[PDB]
Structure 1
Amino acid sequence: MPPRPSSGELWGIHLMPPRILVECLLPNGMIVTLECLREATLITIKHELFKEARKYPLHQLLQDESSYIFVSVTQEAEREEFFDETRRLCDLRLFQPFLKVIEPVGNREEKILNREIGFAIGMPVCEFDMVKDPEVQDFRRNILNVCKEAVDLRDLNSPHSRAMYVYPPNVESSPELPKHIYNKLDKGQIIVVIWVIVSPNNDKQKYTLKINHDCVPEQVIAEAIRKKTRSMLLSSEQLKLCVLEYQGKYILKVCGCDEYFLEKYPLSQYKYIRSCIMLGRMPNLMLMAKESLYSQLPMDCFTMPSYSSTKSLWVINSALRIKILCATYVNVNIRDIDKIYVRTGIYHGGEPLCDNVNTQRVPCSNPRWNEWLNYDIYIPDLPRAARLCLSICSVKGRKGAKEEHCPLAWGNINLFDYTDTLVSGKMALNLWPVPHGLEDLLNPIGVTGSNPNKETPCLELEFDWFSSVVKFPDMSVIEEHANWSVSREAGFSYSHAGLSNRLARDNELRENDKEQLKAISTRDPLSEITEQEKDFLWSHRHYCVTIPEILPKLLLSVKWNSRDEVAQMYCLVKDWPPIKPEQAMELLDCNYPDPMVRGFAVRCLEKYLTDDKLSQYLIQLVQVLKYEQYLDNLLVRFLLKKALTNQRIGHFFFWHLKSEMHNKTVSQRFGLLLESYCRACGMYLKHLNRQVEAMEKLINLTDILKQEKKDETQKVQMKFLVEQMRRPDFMDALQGFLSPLNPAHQLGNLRLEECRIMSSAKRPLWLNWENPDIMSELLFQNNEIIFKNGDDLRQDMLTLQIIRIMENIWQNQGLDLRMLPYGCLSIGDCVGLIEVVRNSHTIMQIQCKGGLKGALQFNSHTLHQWLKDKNKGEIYDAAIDLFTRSCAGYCVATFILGIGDRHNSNIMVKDDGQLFHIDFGHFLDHKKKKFGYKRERVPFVLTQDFLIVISKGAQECTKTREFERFQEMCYKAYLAIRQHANLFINLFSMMLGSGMPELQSFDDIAYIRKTLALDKTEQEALEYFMKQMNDARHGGWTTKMDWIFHTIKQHALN
């Protein structure tokens, strides 16, 4: 039982025929074939069946149909009983179209939930109950503590706390308004519009306030109360008492979407309100009685599920020896491969704890070694996160004296389990395929543990026995051993500064020492850290506390294969000052496997990471879950509790975990995690099922258009799409659910006249929904989402995330470069959603509308001419300025990241002049990993077009005062990102295990060291940037002959 191979309604069939024959197996042994509609509910089918069943022998033996339920086999190989009989036949995921009639047993509500959960996580929860692994069963039970703990924190301050969970405030991370946003106000004031639905008839009433941006929602309500009852003749004392009594009896909500102002932040800190300052948009809020909202809130009821002699390591005086016994098979041609051998190594993150050890060489057809491998490490020196990395390697040497080694299949193993027990006895490990592009012999970054796929080479090992269970020592024993070894090792004589100064005197407070610790901590995380600097950092480890953000580099300077050194490091981290999250997240990547370090990193997140920043880094924080040794850890317990107490976090927590459930390397870890989230998140699971079911209908419908109907015309495919979305099973699923891109938006009835299949080859679906909000006319009357099945969206998702962080860095330094990081969520294997940007067009669409019929070569002024026509008069200067600041930020963003092919097809412009880039998918210059050149000459095609706009149409654009201002924005912005180069290396570093082709090893991330000139000084970097931009110009002598195909007329010059 796995997930699903296809998203079709039957095994091997995308669409059931409008009427289908269903085998029914009655309780009396009879078998009845029954023609059912594919959209028939199980209620209907059972009714039709029991009427048809009277025509069959032994019919009087059947009870009433209310005493039976259906059971059948689903495409996930599961024996599913269907208690919820409201479900249509085509949405049962039946393997074969048959149904067995049985009497229902057990708790109906429990079994309905376990299906809803299994459907949402893409994996039947009965598969978890089948696992013999004690760590899996321990995780399922023990993690319920986090669930109960969070549900109590929700229902503690009822009903306000339940409203905070369901509708968390969407605020910026800081209330301080940078001065270029404050001066966009009117003397620090903003005009808001408060709406009220007054009704026997649902009429709408308007009150216009003018308030400071510091107002808490209670004061905005209070000012509304004031303006309302000023005409209502009242005494001053009653009015001052009327405002004071009823200000906390109402709440404020954004008109159009479900974003409430439930908490006491200043008004301008709310993301909707700060945005309206930037865009110069009129805020339209909706005031409702606080009790009218608490009535909508569903009662979240959480139910506990059904499944709810040791010698110390440090007294084992022996060296580590592991036995390589044999391997089942390897797939090599005996005539082309000489011999095979198992290559081993003991690792801590990425660094070996001793010399790698190889087995003897054996022939391929007989992989048996029976060979003890003896390692250069003592058993008590093994760090907590110590692992065994191995692989089967083939060797062939047919040319001269040179020899060729190649890895065949690999596997990693934690040397202690989740209970701190040193592995013992025999152990069989199923190896993994060699990743594409990997040429090394070992793979210490890949996932630990056996391949769940058991139809692979199976390498048998044996570990040593010590006549007792060996446990990693307790933390009390580790700290005590360090106290009498931290002052017994560090503090001898002064001559210990010239042999191995890891034993020097402990008060060197010189500046040459203090200023080197400053330079070391500011180096980028990918820089080489040398052996002296490791000895130097370690020798001054006690002063590193004064510069606490050096902790990453000091941790790479500890000798992890020495228990005495590690123990001292444990005591230093125990009391280490918490540091900012942007630096604690580095300790959570693949480079820091130790539990005590990662604990510290999580304690810094509990202390400084706001829910807004957790939503900002959620991608990376889910990714690093793959690097945790065990299922039960401090990072997941922190992430789980946070998602269980903020539904906006839990939404994207679900989807990002769900998105990777196809990757079998982590599908169990994320499955077990998604289960415990689903089982405890409260009412949101139902909302998610409407979302999950909505996507499956779109995946199945796009599979058809991409496979069966691929050879048909657009008009015939479009005909097929219309008739499919009008079926009752499609209208039920694709209407009335929450947009996965942004759950604040409600998707109502489909506007089928606006839905279409987009022309591109992946068959994207352009989908349009009504907005069921009563104030939908003031926000989005249209919710437009593009569904794409065929392309990997993770790069687009990462690039867009990065772009948003760059925009924050520029805002904090007074640089107003307006980006547009549109929505993009990946919902599974090469399938996801894209938020549409209303009233925006590609540069090509604007030139195709310029123009002059049959242009072949577009004129350079069409874009500037379009902007003049859209922003005539006084609003012209505000539009040109927006185009300038928006073009500048993307220019620097696309250079630092290496996003290529910037032309009129993936650059878009809003009517009001804001420019933004779309379609990334390829960054860090990874097409050139096969050729070598990381910098040639690819002139930006749209220079002259943009220069005309920036220079407001001057004839000689390069000499205008406006272009010189444009250069300074890019120069200032580029250095701004360069000053934060450690964060972006850290973010990409957290994404290594995700499986993106452009992001496989740390050498892939090294591209931004060159574009950010991290090996230079600040002046040499800026000169480097001006040169790279100068090379990337474009001017008169352009070989512009064709724009569709880009043919080039004569002048071949040969």
Structure 2
Amino acid sequence: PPRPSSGELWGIHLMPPRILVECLLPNGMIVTLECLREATLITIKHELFKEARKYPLHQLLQDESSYIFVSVTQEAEREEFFDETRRLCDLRLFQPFLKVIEPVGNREEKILNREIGFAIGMPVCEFDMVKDPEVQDFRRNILNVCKEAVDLRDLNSPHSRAMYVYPPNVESSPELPKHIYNKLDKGQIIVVIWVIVSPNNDKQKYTLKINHDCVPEQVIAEAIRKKTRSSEQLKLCVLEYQGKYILKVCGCDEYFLEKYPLSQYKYIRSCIMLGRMPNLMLMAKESLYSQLPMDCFTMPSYSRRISTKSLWVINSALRIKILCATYVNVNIRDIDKIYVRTGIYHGGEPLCDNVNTQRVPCSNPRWNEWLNYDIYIPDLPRAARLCLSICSVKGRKGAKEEHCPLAWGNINLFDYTDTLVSGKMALNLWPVPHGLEDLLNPIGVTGSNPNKETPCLELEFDWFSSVVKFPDMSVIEERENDKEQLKAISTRDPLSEITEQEKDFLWSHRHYCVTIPEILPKLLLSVKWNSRDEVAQMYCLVKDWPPIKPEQAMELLDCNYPDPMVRGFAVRCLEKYLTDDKLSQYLIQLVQVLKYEQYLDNLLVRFLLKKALTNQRIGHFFFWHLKSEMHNKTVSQRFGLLLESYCRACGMYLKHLNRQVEAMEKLINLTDILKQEKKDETQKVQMKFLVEQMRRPDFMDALQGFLSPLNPAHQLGNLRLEECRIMSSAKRPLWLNWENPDIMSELLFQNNEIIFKNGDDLRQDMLTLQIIRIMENIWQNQGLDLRMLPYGCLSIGDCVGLIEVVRNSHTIMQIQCQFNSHTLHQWLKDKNKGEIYDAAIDLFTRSCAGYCVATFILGIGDRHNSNIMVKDDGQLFHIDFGHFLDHKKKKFGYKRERVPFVLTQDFLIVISKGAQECTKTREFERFQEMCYKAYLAIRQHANLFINLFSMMLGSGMPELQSFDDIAYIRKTLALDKTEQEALEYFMKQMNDAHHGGWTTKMDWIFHTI
């Protein structure tokens, strides 16, 4: 199973410089060899076979080259070491021993399977074992998606192969917002096209003024026309023949391989907003095509290996027998009795009332009781689940009794082959999530706990003389007052109240609902899922339902819509309308909703995997989001199986991912030492240790020359060891920097500063920074230049992560180090003296507004002088997004929406340019309008944010467990009020928190100025 730690041996983080290794010769002899920890297996094998001649039966040994080494790894796997260039410290050995063997079997398969096993964090042979027919079926059937994606990738080779590795990083639309287009000179952009001239690799400039909507080929034409002319019959011939070059971003691996308006490419789009010069590089297509090695896919070994009644014919009610539970961890003194709580669920909604077993003593968990449910067997929907738990009951405080769940478990009532459950079943139960007080956990995963040393519940389902199968889909298929009310229901947020009257109204007008397709989620919740006749009618309507926007389709993928037809419809809206841009944007959520799927094989998993295998930017983050969760035993089988099929078919990217995986492992190990054995050591002593360790060739080889897991477009070259340090914070973060090996690194990023943190969960931060990015994208699209800074953040494991460092920035507390309240503005004046002073105050004001609105809406952790940073050019940003939403409701029963970012005198003096009476200025009024528009722009897109948070409910994030946690943004966005009342509310929270300065300025009656 997965490795406990990232150590060089079991119970030993680092091997000493010299180590004794037990070598088991094929003649049955044993030679204890003293090896250098960093020696290669070539060296160890040569030094062994020299020594082996000083030992009995030496004559029985073949040539040193007829053999390889085998040993037990920390994953408890027997690994054949075919790659003898690997060092002893990097073998992940359990104990220092090596067994000499002759290589047998399929070398190529074993090597690939080892490379997959290393990347996914578990040996692939563990899957061959799995008895579950659903598992073995997923492993074979998913290969169809693999072959399909590889064929589509190798179709238009080499262009289709280049588009896979280097996909266009483009916006979803060529449409340029009004403020963006006005930043252009009469719709024209000034681009710098660079050429690396042979034989000296000398850099030559070419400034070009061209239309923003110029296709990359058109840009090459202007460069080809400027590099020759500044005739006509020749230019036309030259341009047409010379379309054999490509454009690349200087300093990073972003290519312009597809015919999109230049301005639609995010880098160019970003240059216009920033007022920055776009630096592009011209290189021959041949130079790139020849840097693309072949990505061949091989069908694995497991792919080449060796009376039913309908549900509708079953005339009886649903009953389930609870037999017994092996044990429960409860002290008999504190708890009176124990019982089994059960429910029949469709999503998070019960299909009938919950039923309990009788109360029994703690010492004797036996019930032998049939539970009868108020549901007729043919009326069971396809996504029907049994959600159960063992609960404790303790009275003793008057007639007041306290009920607590002890362990929970969920089961699909139908398996992946549409078979209704029958007969006896043993279910190993899961620990109750920290913070969960509800007696049942319907959002929780299905299936038995793989750890069998846990409470095991015994159940029994009915037998109906045969195998009951869910009926086939063909078998299933057998005014203006009202138009205004419907439109009003459809504009309401995903979590707004739907009255029984509104449900009945929606069901009654179900055929007319097709005229407004966006009302579909509201109509689907109006359905009685416990009625086969209502569902059958809903099925015929969803089959012919008109397409919805991909942002609305994502809602039908959360825990509220478990029906496979509803979910199949949702995946199809994504297949035809979701841009690769938005798929990358929402990937965090799209990966998460795979936990909600009833089965391993589904349309969503097939859609995401085909996309990961046809776009390497999606594949990169798809791999890391799945890998970071491989410790989580609720999803590790599902995710490990999905990762195996991705790694098996991703081509050459596996070699690159394994380099990232191994770089991260060394950093995990290095920090574990600093945090454990060396925890009591001083900063100087810890720093001396880091310097010595980072100089070692094993470390140097692994941590230099790989792609950044934050952005694989950035190449991490040689480490800048003099700039690498252990930070002062509590969990020993590492501040690292690498050279950018790109020929043109000077122009984009000469620095690749990253904070490696082993100790805290970075998932919440990663979610917050995603939201800030989406919010900033809403603002820009609406012409609001509120510049946000969503710095890179990636969770790479269990409380392990990367943070992109923001260069030329300081915390408020750093700036304050004189005693003043004018210190901040004085600091900014001294950094932006002269003509560039106005641009700095603008930037500070704009970034300030964005952060003010964003942190308020989200209910982010309290702001302070260490949490708030300012760039040299005035740009303000927040750091440390460990908390959000209602994090203080349980701790302090207080009910008031906090204003995390209170703009004190310091920030006011900056915005009002030092002026006395800061709130009375025209700069403060301007800043208020920014906040107002920003606030309403987010409220107008509330459905998106609610859906993005709803998609994360099963993630395991402490501050996102229920829809009740999401109710906070419904409050901050005043979603149950009018837009005008909501702006009044925001103004009131700003006024209460700032003690005046924010009141009306428009008229309270009509809100006109």
Q: TM-score, normalised by structure 2?
A: 0.97
Q: Deviations over 1:426-476 (max 9, x none)?
A: 110001112222222211111111111111111111111111111111111
Q: Name the counterpart of 2:668.
A: 699
The change in CA–CA distance for 1:981 and 1:178 in structure 2 (over 3 A counts) is same
CA contact (8 A) 2:347 2:442 kept: yes
1:406 Cα deviation (Å)?
Answer: 2.2
Give the match's secondary structure for 2:397: coil
Matching residue within 423, 439, 442 for 2:440: 442
User: Identity, % of aligned pairs?
Assistant: 100
Gap change, CA 1:198 and 1:723, over 3 Å in 2: same
For residues 567 and 1040 of structure 1, what CA distance do their matches in structure 2 show? 56
1:106-153 Cα distance to aligned partner (Å, 9 max, x none)? 111211111110110011101111100111110011000000000000
2:496·2:976 contact (CA, 8 Å) conserved in 1? no
The offset of 1:399, in angstroms, is 3.3
Q: Secondary structure at the match of 2:35?
A: strand
Deviations 1:506-559 (A, max 9, x none): xxxx12222221222222222232222211211111111111111111111111
Q: Secondary structure at the match of 2:753?
A: strand
SS at the partner of 1:427?
strand
**Structure 2 residue 869 is matched with structure 1 residue 918:** no
Report what 1:115 is aligned to: 114
Contact 1:549 1:583 in 2 (8 A): yes
Shift of 1:1034: 6.4
Checking the alignment, whether the CA contact within 8 Å between 1:388 and 1:412 is kept in structure 2 is yes
- CA drift of 1:302 comes to 1.0
CA distance in 2, matches of 1:282, 1:652: 29
Closer/same/farther in 2, CA of residues 400 and 943 from structure 1, 3 Å limit: closer
Which of 359, 362, 378 pairs up with 1:361? 359
Moved more, 327-336 or 651-660: 327-336
Equivalent pair of 2:991/2:999 in contact (CA under 8 Å): no
Contact 1:121 1:674 in 2 (8 A): yes
In structure 2, do the counterparts of structure 1 residues 815 and 1044 end up closer, same or farther at CA, with 3 Å as the change threshold? closer
Q: Secondary structure at the match of 1:783?
A: coil
Point out the more displaced range, 434-443 or 987-996.
434-443
Contact kept in structure 2, 1:342 and 1:391, CA below 8 Å:
yes
1:408 aligns with 2:406: yes
Distance of 1:765 and 1:939 partners within structure 2: 28
CA contact (8 A) 1:858 1:1043 kept: no
Mapped partners of 2:534, 2:410: distance in 1: 25
Partner secondary structure for residue 407 of structure 1: strand
Q: 2: distance between equivalents of 1:397 and 1:1045?
A: 57
Provide the rounded CA distance (Å) in 2 between the counterparts of 1:939 and 1:411. Answer: 39
1:1042 and 1:686 map into 2 onto residues whose CA distance is: 64
Equivalent pair of 2:250/2:744 in contact (CA under 8 Å) = yes
Q: Write the deviation string for residues 223-276 of structure 1: whole angstroms up to 9, x where unpaired.
A: 11101111xxxx934423334323421111111111111111111111111111
Which range moved further: 79-88 or 115-124?
Answer: 79-88
Q: Would the aligned equivalents of 2:831 and 2:872 in 1 still touch at CA under 8 Å?
A: yes
Change (3 A) 1:413 1:936: closer
Give yes or no for contact 2:856–2:900 (8 Å, CA) kept in 1: no
Looking at structure 2, the residues matched to 1030 and 966 of structure 1 have their Cα atoms a distance apart, in angstroms, of 14
- CA-to-aligned-CA distance 1:1013-1053 (integer Å, 9 cap, x gap): 112212211111111111222699999999999999xxxxx
Report SS of the residue matched to 1:525. Answer: coil
8 Å contact kept, 2:409–2:448: yes
Q: Does structure 2 conserve the Cα–Cα contact (< 8 Å) formed by 1:826 and 1:833?
A: yes
CA displacement 1:905-960 (0-9 Å, x = unmatched):
11111111111111111111303422111428778565211111111221222111
Q: Is 1:307 the counterpart of 2:302 in the alignment?
A: yes
How much has 1:589 moved relative to structure 2?
A: 0.5
Q: Distance in 1 between matches of 2:539 and 2:423?
A: 30
Give per-residue Cα distances to partners, 1:398-429, cap 9 Å, x unaligned: 23333332222111100100010111111100
**1:572 correspondence with 2:570:** no
CA deviations on 1:604-658 (whole Å, 9 max, x unpaired) are: 0011100000000000000000000000000000000001000000000000111
Q: Distance in 2 between matches of 1:1041 and 1:350?
A: 45
Question: Aligned partners of 2:951, 2:119: CA distance in 1, in Å?
Answer: 26
What SS class does the counterpart of residue 749 from structure 2 fall into?
coil
Please say which of residues 409-418 and 931-940 is displaced more in the overlay.
931-940
Q: 1:637 to 1:281 in 2, by over 3 A?
A: same
Shifted more, 403-412 versus 914-923: the winner is 403-412
Deviations 1:151-175 (A, max 9, x none): 0001100110000001001111111
Equivalent pair of 1:804/1:819 in contact (CA under 8 Å): yes
CA distance in 1, matches of 2:608, 2:463: 38
Output one character per residue of 1:712-746: Cα deviation in whole Å (capped at 9) or x when no partner. 11111111101101111100100000000000010
- 1:361-415 Cα shifts (integer Å, max 9, x gaps): 3222222222222211111111001011111122222233333322221111001
Q: Distance in 2 between matches of 1:745 and 1:936?
A: 40
In structure 2, relative to structure 1, the CA distance for the partners of 1:938 and 1:643 (3 Å cut) is closer
Residues 262 and 268 of structure 2 are in contact (CA less than 8 Å); yes or no, is this contact kept in structure 1?
yes
Relative to structure 2, which stretch is displaced further, 419-428 or 624-633?
419-428
Secondary structure in structure 2 of the residue aligned to 1:873: coil
Inter-CA distance 353–1035: structure 2 relative to 1 (3 Å threshold): closer
Superimposed CA distance per residue, residues 811-840 of structure 1 (whole angstroms, 9 cap, x where no aligned partner): 222211111111111101111111111222
**TM-score normalized by the length of structure 1:** 0.93
Q: Residues 899 and 989 of structure 2 are in contact (CA less than 8 Å); yes or no, is this contact kept in structure 1?
A: no
Encode CA deviations 1:271-320: one digit per residue, 9 max, x unaligned.
11111112221111110111111111111111111111222111111221
CA contact (8 A) 1:428 1:460 kept: yes
Which residue in the other structure is 2:740 paired with? 771
Q: Deviations over 1:15-69 (max 9, x none)?
A: 1101111111111111111111111111111111111111111111111121111
CA 684–841 in structure 1, closer or farther in 2 if over 3 Å, else same:
same
Q: Please say if residues 856 and 899 of structure 2, whose CA atoms lie closer than 8 Å, have aligned partners that are also in contact.
A: no
Q: Secondary structure at the match of 1:439?
A: coil
Contact 2:860 2:900 in 1 (8 A): no
Consecutive unaligned residues of structure 1, counting only runs of 5 or more, are 481-509, 849-856, 1049-1054
Q: Deviations over 1:170-191 (max 9, x none)?
A: 1111111111111212222111
Aligned equivalents of 1:368, 1:1047: Cα separation in 2: 71
Cα distance in 1, alignment partners of residues 810 and 385 from structure 2? 53
In the alignment, the residues of structure 1 paired with residue 1008 and residue 726 of structure 2 have an alpha-carbon distance, to the nearest angstrom, of 29
Q: Does 2:566 match 1:597?
A: yes
1:442–1:462: structure 2 CA closer, same or farther, 3 Å change rule? Answer: same
2:861–2:883 contact (8 Å) kept in structure 1: yes
Q: Is the 8 A contact 1:135 1:418 kept in 2?
A: yes
Work out whether residues 899 and 990 of structure 2, in 8 Å CA contact, stay in contact via their aligned partners in 1: no
Judged with a 3 Å threshold, the aligned counterparts in structure 2 of structure 1 residues 940 and 424 are, in CA distance, closer, same or farther, namely: closer
- Correspondence list, 1:272-671, <5 A: 272-308=267-303, 309-480=307-478, 510-671=479-640
Q: Tell me, what secondary structure is at the counterpart of 2:48?
A: helix
User: CA separation of 1:172/1:421 partners in 2, compared to 1, >3 Å: closer, same or farther?
Assistant: same
Q: Is the Cα–Cα contact under 8 Å of residues 944 and 1034 in structure 1 kept in the other structure?
A: no
* Larger displacement relative to structure 2 (186-195 or 402-411): 402-411
Q: Secondary structure at the match of 1:46?
A: helix
Q: Secondary structure at the match of 1:936?
A: coil
C-alpha separation between the residues in 1 aligned to 2:597 and 2:997? 56
> Are 2:409 and 2:430, in contact at CA under 8 Å, matched by a contact in 1?
yes
**Which one is further off, 901-910 or 330-339?**
330-339
User: Hey, what's the Cα distance between the residues in 2 that align with 1:1040 and 1:29?
Assistant: 92
Provide the rounded CA distance (Å) in 2 between the counterparts of 1:395 and 1:919.
41
1:804 counterpart SS class: helix
Assess if the C-alpha contact under 8 Å between 1:21 and 1:35 holds in 2: yes
Aligned partners of 1:899 and 1:925 also within 8 Å? no
SS in 1 for 2:411: strand
Contact 1:69–1:101 at 8 Å: present in 2 too? yes
Using a 3 Å threshold, how does the CA distance of structure 1 residues 606 and 956 change in structure 2: closer, same or farther? Answer: same
Q: Distance in 2 between matches of 1:335 and 1:845?
A: 55
Off by >6 Å, runs of 4+ in structure 1: 936-939, 1034-1048
Q: 1:1025 to 1:730 in 2, by over 3 A?
A: same
User: Secondary structure of the equivalent of 1:398?
Assistant: strand
Instruction: Report whether the alignment pairs 1:257 with 2:256.
Output: no
